[PDB]
Amino acid sequence: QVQLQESGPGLVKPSETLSLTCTVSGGSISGYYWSWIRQPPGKGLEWIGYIHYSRSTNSNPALKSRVTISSDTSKNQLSLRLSSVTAADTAVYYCARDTYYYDSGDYEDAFDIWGQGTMVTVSSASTKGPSVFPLAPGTAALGCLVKDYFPEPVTVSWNSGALTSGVHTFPAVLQSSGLYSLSSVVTVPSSSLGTQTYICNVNHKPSNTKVDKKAEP
Amino acid sequence: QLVLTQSPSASASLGASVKLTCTLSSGHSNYAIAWHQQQPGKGPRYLMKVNRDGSHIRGDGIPDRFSGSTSGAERYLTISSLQSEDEADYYCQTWGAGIRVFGGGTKLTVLGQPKAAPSVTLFPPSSEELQANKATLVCLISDFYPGAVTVAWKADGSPVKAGVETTTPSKQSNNKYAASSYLSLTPEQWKSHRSYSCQVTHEGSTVEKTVAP
Ligand SMILES: CC(=O)N[C@@H]1[C@@H](O)[C@H](O)[C@@H](CO[C@@H]2O[C@H](CO[C@@H]3O[C@H](CO[C@@H]4O[C@H](CO[C@@H]5O[C@H](CO)[C@@H](O)[C@H](O)[C@H]5NC(C)=O)[C@@H](O)[C@H](O)[C@H]4NC(C)=O)[C@@H](O)[C@H](O)[C@H]3NC(C)=O)[C@@H](O)[C@H](O)[C@H]2NC(C)=O)O[C@H]1O
């Protein structure tokens, strides 16, 4: 199955350059245009530009002076470089597979496969990794408090991913300090608070923080 | 001047049908478009391509309740048997000469969903957090609809307004909303009171959870 996966740093200082990659698996990148798209938190989709390695590249006129898109057939990979970033560039960035151009000049317009999206925050505040604390007291709720990190996002799993039913990770709160905090909770049988061990696994990629916390009553 | 014009919102009832409209700018009124759906908290997914003759072709795995059509400069997305999961922002998108452009998106509200009371969990500060010389009470609010609550904190019955931070509600996997509220105390404050309470009000009904040192 063709799949697209964006990656890049989640934090960029103002005026520096944002670099992203779109790695394609399950099929070749040859022949297609590949588009970059972004979405500021709570706003609409904005097309950034596209590339077809052996034909042409172009970008949104509002952004063209700062946009460089390229590809790497050896890695089956597209890239986006956005220079002199500003607060307006804080967004989730997506890649998508666009029009196919046949050798003859004919083409098939399409926009049918999207990547997962990668979140980029533009800020002068340094990265800060979370402190993680257990939350503990029919069913019972256990959880993990993920305190005082920057930038978004953090991911939380339970028992190394073996526990997914009844896991709810809440949206983060943004404090007056400029740091985020969130909580993740697993709902479990009351009887199982002795039949089972519950460990949250917290990942904050921008700070390279990975911590595991036992949550027990 | 390639512009795709969408109304910012639309609404219809559960089980009914809704028609969303994208209008192409006059210099481009014969263009094909694509429809993309973005459910809350998710990345976009492709639904279908709608051509200038009114024919459409759905993406792999997209159900037949989604259809598209054309009249003049207008392109339509029709969704029948509406479910709560159809609450989303819908974007039209087209292929210009050397450019792609998106409409502004239409946010679809699906009316007639059942009221659901919040479930509330209140956690005390952990021993480990107290060892870091902090104390945070965590009030987690889930599974409610419509998506608005208010939160009030009390210590030994008296209101507490300092140190409270509360998120905005947001839609979840189960088609219901979630929010959380945090109360920051010193370890000494936490230990000095007999109990703290988180009171959540939803549609005129108030529930309360309590924790004690
Ligand atoms: C320097 C630089 O970057 N230059 C770029 C250059 O790279 C690029 O190649 C060109 C062109 O860019 C492409 O632009 C087109 C849209 O152009 C407009 O096309 C209008 C027609 O609509 C397209 O029709 C295609 C054929 O449809 C079939 O026609 C049959 C005969 O009538 C009929 O029997 C079939 O039923 C029709 N099929 C369907 C499915 O309806 C169709 O294949 C396309 O999908 C249609 N495109 C759209 C958007 O609907 C035409 O009326 C306009 O005059 C054209 N406008 C201009 C300004 O030329 C894009 O579709 C394509 O994606 C673009 N390609 C790229 C790489 O961007 O632009 C330079 O600037």
Q: Give the ligand 1 atom nearest the CA of A33.
A: 67
Contact across the interface for B45 and A114, Cβ inside 8 Å: yes
Contact A66, A83 (CB under 8 A): yes
H, E, C per residue of A44-62: CCEEEEEEECCCEEEECCC
B145 is written with which tokens? 């609809």
**Any atom of ligand 1 within 6 Å of the Cβ of A39:** no
Residue whose CB lies within 8 A of the most ligand 1 atoms, among A34, A53, A55, A109, for a mutation test: A109
H/E segment holding residue B189: helix B187-192
**DSSP string over B68-108:** EEEETTEEEEEE-S--GGG-EEEEEEEEETTEEEE---EEE
> To test the ligand 1 pocket, which listed residue (B26, B31, B50, B101) has its Cβ within 8 A of the most ligand atoms?
B31
**Two tokens, residue A88:** 């307006």
List Cβ neighbours of B32 (8 Å cut-off, separation of 6 or more). A109, B49, B50, B51, B52, B94, B95
Task: Please state the three-class secondary structure of A75-112 as a single string.
Answer: HCEEEEEECCCCHHHCEEEEEEEEEEECCCCCEECCCC
- Up-side HSE of residue B81: CA atoms within 13 Å toward CB? 4
Question: What's the reported resolution, in angstroms, to a tenth?
Answer: 1.9
Q: What is the chain A residue with the closest CA to B137?
A: A135
Q: Which residue has the tokens 């944002």?
A: A18
Q: Would you list the DSSP string of A187-215?
A: EEEGGGTTT---EEEEEEGGGTEEEEEE-
Q: Whose Cα sits closest to atom 45 in ligand 1?
A: A109
Contact list, A145 vs chain B (CB under 8 Å): 123, 126, 129, 136, 138
Domain boundaries of chain B, sorted by first residue: 1-112, 113-213
For residue A53, count other CB atoms closer than 10 A to its CB: 17
Tokens of A152: 């978004």
DSSP letter (8 states) at residue B2:
-
Strands A3-7 and A56-59 come out as unpaired
Cβ neighbourhood burial of A145 (10 Å; 0-12, 13-18, 19+): buried
Q: Determine the 3-state secondary structure of A166 from DSSP.
A: coil
- State whether the beta carbon of B32 lies less than 6 angstroms from ligand 1: yes
Phi and psi at B205, nearest 5°, equal -115, 130
Q: What CATH homologous superfamily does B113-213 map to?
A: Immunoglobulins (2.60.40.10)
Option in B32, B44, B168 nearest A45 (CB): B44
C-alpha separations of B84 from A30, A171, B76, B203, B208 in Å: 39, 21, 20, 20, 29
A64's tokens = 């063209």
Contact B49, B34 (CB under 8 A): yes
Q: Structural domains in chain A?
A: 1-124 (no CATH), 125-215 (2.60.40.10)
How many Cβ atoms sit within 10 Å of the Cβ of residue A16? Answer: 13
Other CB atoms within 10 A of residue B110 CB: 22
d(CA B112, CA A62): 42
- Judged on CB neighbours under 10 Å (0-12, 13-18, 19+), B99 is middle
Contact residues for B151 (Cβ-Cβ < 8 A; gap 6+): B139, B141, B164, B166, B179, B181, B198, B199, B200, B201
| Pairing assessment for the beta strands B74-79 and B66-71 based on DSSP bridges | antiparallel
Q: Give the residue from chain A lying closest to B135, CA to CA.
A: A133
B101 token code pair? 């452009």
What end-to-end distance do the CA atoms of chain B give, in Å?
64
B9's CB contacts (< 8 A; 6+ apart) are B106, B107, B108, B109
